[PDB]
Amino acid sequence: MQIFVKTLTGKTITLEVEPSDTIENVKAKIQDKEGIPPDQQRLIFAGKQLEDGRTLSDYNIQKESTLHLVLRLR
C-alpha cells in the first residue's frame, strides 16, 4: 500500500509500505527517497510521535494515510 509523509516545508513523499513495516523501516524508506538519516527523522501521526520498534499497523496507519516528518539534529 502507499502512504504519504509531509514536511512542514511543503514536501510530500510517497512511500510503498506493508502494514507490518516497522517505523524504523519506514524511516529507512524515507532515507532511500530523500537521503535523510533515520536518526534525524521524527515521524508523527494522529497526534503522537512514533517509536521505532512498532509497526504501522500498531499505530493504526492505513493505506493512503498521511504522516508528518520533522527533522531533529540530535
Binding site: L8, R42, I44, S65, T66, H68, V70, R72
Partner: peptide, 20 residues
C-alpha cells in the same frame, strides 16, 4: 535551534490532528 525544533514538533502534532 533546539527551541525551534520543539515548536516544530508541536506544529506537526497539531497538524496531524487534522492531516491524517
Amino acid at each position: 535551534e533546539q527551541e525551534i525544533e520543539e515548536l516544530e514538533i508541536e506544529i506537526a502534532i497539531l497538524l496531524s490532528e487534522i492531516e491524517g
